[PDB]
Each structure stands twice: as C-alpha cells, then as structure tokens.
Symmetry: D2
Subunit: 258 residues, 4 copies
C-alpha cells in the first residue's frame, strides 16, 4: 500500500494496522490509499495510473464524490484493505492528443475533464468542435470541456452541463462560455472522437486534465479526445449510491418521497 494524505491524523491508525499484517514511479505497490478530498483522489489516481493498481479514498475534510468511505470508519476499511476482498472496477478514462501538421506533438489523460481553455486572459478562442469526423460548431468561447461521467459533476457542471451518473459510459462535451446560439452540452457514445480545432490565426491555448496536468496548445492545432484503452482502477465498497452523494453535495430537497 502506497498511502497519500492531506485534523488529518487518522493517518496513523492506518500504519498501525498495516504493519500488523518519492512521487513519479512511486507505484511499485498493490494498492493506493488516499485520505483527503476529491482533489487528493485525483492526485493519487495520477500515481496509481502508471503501474495500474486500484485507488481507494477516505473522506477526511469535506464531502465529495470519489471517496468510498468516511473518516470515522477508517478501521472497517482497513479490514478490507487486509482482506484484499473489495471489487476493483475499471472506470472510463479519457485519452487526449494534440496534433500539429498531422503529427502528434503532445499527449495526456483524464478521469474527470479535459479542459481546453483560452490563452490570453482577454479575448476569445476560436474553436471548431468536431464529432466522429464531422464538424458540429464553430464559435468563440472560453474553452471546451470534454468530460467523463465522473467529471460531469466538477467543472463541466459549473460550465452548465448535465449530471451524468458515474456508471454510465459516455463522453460529455460542454462548450465553456461560447458566444453562440447553441452552446448546449452534447453527449456521446464511449466509442466516439471529439476533436477541437484551435484557430490558426489566434493565440496559443491551454489544456488542463483533472485540473492538474497542464499542456500547451499551439495555435492552429487539433485536440483529439477519445476513450482510453487503459482505465483507472477504482476500489469499491458498501459506499452510498451516487444519487445520495449528489443529494448531500448540493443539499437537494427530497421531502415527500415514498
């Protein structure tokens, strides 16, 4: 067990029960356990990625979407860490390439969001969004989010997208502040290719993945996002349903229900 953390000192009760029984290639292990927030989980996934092992997440501070257990139950988790018994479920991951003159110049991955974004703070990004080899819209905007159903709850939600339950397989596209009549979010089979075409004449742009790995989009290039061949592995427990998490998260009213 790699253990990534951070009142965050239930950190010790983890090392207690585990011994009872440098970040980059820091994988080597069989499981990653994270004690922290949604952001921390995204961080651990980074690490679990390269030597494809499961991730598990324990919610210390706030209330998020990814962690599979509360803090005040860190023991009932350890039992399962020992027991090796949890179902590990593969989850849709996005693959992104950046291509100039037909040639792949940069490449990345996300489990929440590929967020192509304006370069200069002032002005707009000309972009042509493309779906399965055909164009759907040209407009200027702050960027385009290409999102996973897990990620459909993060930034893409802020950009105004719909909420996708986490066990669905789809790719979500939410144009981010598009100056245009149809800036409607679009949803697409997991088999599809979203390509966005940065304006040749304009300035360079950025992409961000899981709000943490940055790339540089040269003017005139092409982002291709498709479903990735090697998913992220998620530990799963007797956690609450996504539905319950959405409800808690957003204090959604639910009185009157049978």
């Amino acid at each position: 067990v790699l253990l990534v953390v951070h009142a965050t000192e239930t950190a010790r009760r983890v090392e207690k029960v585990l011994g009872d029984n440098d970040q980059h290639a820091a994988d080597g292990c069989e499981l990653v356990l994270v004690l922290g927030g949604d952001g921390t989980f995204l961080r651990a996934a980074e690490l679990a990625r390269n030597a494809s092992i499961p991730v598990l997440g324990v919610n210390l501070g706030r209330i998020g979407f990814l962690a599979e257990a509360e803090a005040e139950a860190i023991d009932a988790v350890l039992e399962h860490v020992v027991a090796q018994d949890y179902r590990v479920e593969d989850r849709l991951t996005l693959d992104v390439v950046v291509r100039q003159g037909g040639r792949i110049v940069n490449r990345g991955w996300a489990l929440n969001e590929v967020s192509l974004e304006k370069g200069p703070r002032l002005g707009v990004l000309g972009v042509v969004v493309e779906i399965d080899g055909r164009p759907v819209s040209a407009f200027g905007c702050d960027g385009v989010l290409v999102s996973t159903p897990t990620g459909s709850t993060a930034y893409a939600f802020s950009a105004g997208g719909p909420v996708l339950w986490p066990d669905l397989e789809a790719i979500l596209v939410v144009p981010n502040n598009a100056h245009a009549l149809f800036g409607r979010p679009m949803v697409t089979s997991p088999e599809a290719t979203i390509a966005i075409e940065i304006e040749a004449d304009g300035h360079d742009a950025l992409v961000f993945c899981d709000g943490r790995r940055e790339m540089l989009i040269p003017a005139g290039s092409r982002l291709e996002v498709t479903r990735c061949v090697t998913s992220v592995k998620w530990a799963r427990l007797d956690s609450a349903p996504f539905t319950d998490r959405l409800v808690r998260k957003f204090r959604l009213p639910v009185t009157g229900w049978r």
Copy 2:
C-alpha cells in the same frame, strides 16, 4: 404467399410522385403494396385499416419525423423494421429524401439494408403497488401537469433513491433519439443516437436544481405524483396518452423490445443536427 410492404404517407405533395414510384417498383418485383385506408380514401395493392398492419416485411414511411413515429407504432406491433423518406421538411429519423427514392427501392427489394435496434423505453404507471397502465416510447415519455394552472408536485427517483422534489409543468424522460425533440425545447442536452443512455429533463421546474440528468441504459427512473394534488398525464411520442392518477408512481425503464430501424448509407447525426439547426460550421479542417 408473397412479400408486402406497408406504406404510410403524410397526405398531397410531390408525395404522389414518390408514392406512385413506390407502387411502380414493388409491382415490377412482385412485392405487394399495402396502404392505410384513410390515406387511400383521398385517393398489387391491399388496403388495411390502421391497427395491426403486419404480414409485411418493412414499413416504408413517406413524410417527416412525426410521421415516422406513427409508423413505428404500427411497426412495433409485428416487430418489423421501419424506413422513412423525407418529403417536405428536414428531420432526424428518415434515412433518405424523396429525390433518392429509386435508390431506396433497390434496397427495399434486395432487402440488403442494415436493421438496428434503437433503444426504446418502457413505462409503467403504478398505483398502490399494482400496475394500472403501461406504455412505451422511442422518443420521450412526457409526464405533464393535468390542469392548466397550478404546479405538479413530483419526486424524481433514480435507481431506488430520491433525487429531487419540486413542482413543475412536468418531467421528460428521453431516449437519446428523443433528445432532439421536446426534451431539447425544455432545456436538454443533445445526445447522439447511438449512445445508449437515458435522459431526464425536468419540464419548467420552479426550483433551483432542474438540471438534465443522464443515466445509463440499465437505470430505473421513477417519478412520484403528489398524492394530494390532481391527476397528471403522460404522453408517449406525442401520441399515446395515459391518465396518471394522483398519488401514483411512474417507472421508466429500457424496453427489451427495441424498435427495429432500417438503416441506410445516410448522413451522420452530426450532419443532421447541423442542417436542422443551421449550426455555424465554417472554418473546419
């Protein structure tokens, strides 16, 4: 025994050039046309009343989107594929336009076309535990306020836990295919026709969260009609109506009986979306 095709036509246009061309081709090939009596009453050729016209291999539809949907009600019955040709306006469901009629007919005859099972929804109105009506939809199930003024108390439940209680004009539960229709009007996202998912769009919900939700094809969406209020209504495909009683419960699920759609060498969904909505697409690659 013989082959037969059922032809469903909008009714008068260059809808007659096309109909006659259909009567011609199948005639030449010993395939019997069959038409709907009302349609044949403003002028081999059998003539059926409109309930279950089957015995046929294909339902050929000449007209537009709303027409396709009538045709599919007819096809659902004997579960036979439907194929649509556009006459006047621009739609999402036809696989060709009249100006390519002759070519379709080569396919109608050869029967060489692909037949996809497009996702279909299954609805049950349940009261007191006991199912009191059922329906199905290929586009949308539209739960809607009964009386014109007032609001409809609703709780939306997804996979067995409640997601939201509000008042609204209604709730749409939509097929990817139906995301283009009423759901779009009500604020929904466009979903691509091949995706298998389920879309929920609260209709005119007076409340903060009325986001579209999208769900995998295996989910159950249930909507509980406020007991004390008035009876609601559900509409499937803007054609079949069920009276939802106050206090009942509506479950929508993926149907096991897909509508068979007869597929051709046609435009991608993207292109059709662009055409319909005049989407600005200059500058592309």
Copy 3:
C-alpha cells in the same frame, strides 16, 4: 357624506384575525368593506349587524359587489400571493393601495404575517405606510386588424398553447420588428414582480420588484435562441399566433383567461395605471428571495 373606507379581502375557510381587523377598524371609526361572496359565507363567519354594532364598528359595508365598484383608502388582503393578486384585481378599478398580511406560506408580495396584524392594523389606522407603483401590463388581442378582447396583469401574461399535443407556432415582435419565430409551449410576458413566478420556472432571470422593465421568456421554445429578453418599459411585445395552427389561450395572473384565435395577435404594453402597493418596514426583496429559494448566503460581513 365624508368618511374613511377600508376593503377587507380574505381567503375564506386564521380568518378571525379578520375580526381583529373588524374590532380595531371600528374603534377608529374606519369602514371595513366586504364583497358579495365575502358576506354570503365565512370570512364573514360573524356576518351580522347584531355583531357589527355590538362591536361598536359602523363596519361591514357589504354593499360592495365585486369588481368595478368602490371609493376607499386601502385594500387589506389577508391570505396569500394568490389572494393579493385577487385584491389587486379589484383595487385596479378604484386605483388604490393593497396591503397583504400572510396567513400561511411565505409569499413574495405580502408585507407581513398574521402574528403582526396588531401592528399592521396600527399602521393602517395611521395611514402611515408607503405607497409604491409596481409595473402593470396591458394586453390586447387583435384580429383582422382590430381589438377583439383585452386584459391586464400585475404578474404575467402567459400565452399558452391550446390543445395538449403538438406545439404552438409563434412570431415574437418587439417594438414593431420581429425577433424570433419558433414553435413553443407558449410565451410569458412578465413584469419584474412576476419574474419570480411561472417566468422563473420557465427559465427567466430574477428581476428586482422596483425595476421598470418587461420580461419575455419563451416557454419551451424549440429553437437555439429562446433566451429570456428584457425590454424597456415602453416597448411593445406582440406575439402573432400562427393561422394554420390552433387557437390558444392566455392567462393573466393565473386567473383572467382569454381565448386567442389562430392567426390573431397579442400586444402587451406597459399600462398607464400602475397598481399601488402599501408598503411597511418589511424585508427587502433580497431577503425574500434568499428565503423562498433557500439561497446559500454565508461567510459575509
């Protein structure tokens, strides 16, 4: 001859705070009006002059029949938003202030709740409230060139599609020129006051009550642009209902209904005579919004 009159309006069936009106309104030599309906049933549970003089209250001038009838100082609705809208109804004829006390649910238009009717009534007596003109709308229906029905609204004018199925085709024109043609469920021409109601539901932004503007929110427009539009107070919204389609209906303030024939034309304009709203030291519109939508507000000064 010379005299002080005050119209009670109530939601019949805490309606006895209504007699607390009838008490206090008497010892002050006021009025207490009531309508036909208001005094053929409850609300006037104590309907009798055998109670209205035993109270020392030259009170109950039931005389008043509903609508185009009366010359008072104020209208005092106890009831809800529903009812304030009723009262406003009448009052608009007489062109006089409306003051609403809230029995049940929290409303946007009520100046107080019943646990206060004591103080409320004290301010009524003293005439020491504030009056304030809220924007009111005027709607006409015009067919074959000429007016063929007319209406008015304080909240919304809701043009709604007639038959249950299919869709209503509509061209929306603002100050003379067309702005969007689409099929929809309808179109809301709303007041700032009314942007809280159906218009909100239908996606409109929230407008502060004092603002002077007109809000247009296409209801479920099947179109890329069905944004809400906000227009100056003196614009003219016109919606032409398509000819080949069906008739339609409009409702003003969720009550005064009008049939809108196919091919006719709706024109909404600000009305010359605003409704007048009696106003106390009450919550600003901000706090009402924060309460009725339960808005997250914290980490502030």
Copy 4:
C-alpha cells in the same frame, strides 16, 4: 475652431472620405490608430480627444470600446461607423459614410446619455482602486486553476455565495457580449438596469439577476484565496486583493452616445445571431 478625433482600426476609403469632407468643411482631424494645423496623428493616450467635439470610429465593436474610452475621458459623444463586420454599437455602416459625415459637419445628431457602470475596489474602509464600464465589469479567477470564492450582495444584503470562475456585472448594452456567453439574458440598450451574471458558478442558483439602476452590487472576494482580476470593457484590467470588496453602481456621468437614424436593436440582434424570423405579419 472645431475638431474631431478619428479612431480607425487600420478601411482606407472611408478614412479618406472623412479626411476629405472634414477638410472641405474646416474641421480639424485627429487620427488615432486603434491597434496602438488641419490634421494630426496622435499617440495612443488617454487624453487624445481632449478638445474635440466628437469621437468618430470606423471599425467593429472592439474598436468602439477603445474610442468610447477616449470620448468618456474628454466627456464628449462617440459615433461609430461599421467597416468589415456586423456590430451592435455603430450607428451606421460604411456605405452610408457620406450621409453620416453630413451630420458630423452639421452637429445635428441627438446625443443620449447611456447607462455606464462605476466600479470601486475597497479594502478595509479605504478605496484602493477604481474603474468604469460601458459593457461589463468582469470579476475573474486569478489563477488559471481552482475556483474563486465569492459572496454577491445587493443593496448591502447578501444574495449568494458560491465558487465560480468570476462574476459579470453588466450594462444592458453589455448583455449582448461576454455576459451573453456566460448565460445571460438579452437586454434592450435603452433599458436602464444592471445585470448580474455569475460566471461558471459551481452552484444550483447561478441565475442572472437584473437590478434597478440605483442598486449597489457588491462582491466580496474570499479573504483566504488568491487575488482576482477585474476587466472592464474587455480592456482595462485591475488587480483585486484577496479579501476585498468590489462595488459596482451606476456612474454619475455617463458616456455620451451620438445617435442617428439607425436600425433598431431588434434588427441588430436578428442580424448578428441570424435569428429565424419567417412568417411575421
């Protein structure tokens, strides 16, 4: 002596005809390039129009804004003529340059005050920066990543607190621009109101508010986050200290807008957005 500042984007046929007619008529011409005695070429300077009777602009909306800046600083009218593109802000299009010039010479055009927003950055009781806007104050996330903490307040009373990319406070003229991009409703430019539009707010109520033009819109910047930016009319930047309080009110002296016999807004709107309009009347 009468004088006019001409702001052209740098296109020449129009520019020449202006040079021409204002010569023939004894009006001094100051030319300023927008990228940046009978005629002068003037440096880009906030005081360029300080003596002129009018600012005339050839170009689209972005240029109008640059010109408006100057006209505001010299407290005189601006007038725009469109060149290449379609805009909301010009009063006439290049082909009608002659007619326009005639009015320029004549000084017979209506000049209407148009609502302008005044913005202040206040911190600990002192006002520590300030600005104005004719389109929008755009309060924005400082760091490219992360969200910005915000509490939005109307006449002293809080209305919402959420994380966001920023908050737009917009002028009705403005409602057509970035505000529109952000989800805003469209506002007729004669209307006098202030529009608030949250920008990518991770919350259920991100709904546009529209406020009487006497309101005080304030925004309190989370004391624990990073600095934020504010941009005005897509062009005048201001650093916003963490913990401070933005305030936007209607400015006392507004921008003067020369008017003319132009298309009504409704048309402008239909023109830009290619709004479907068939079957009318």
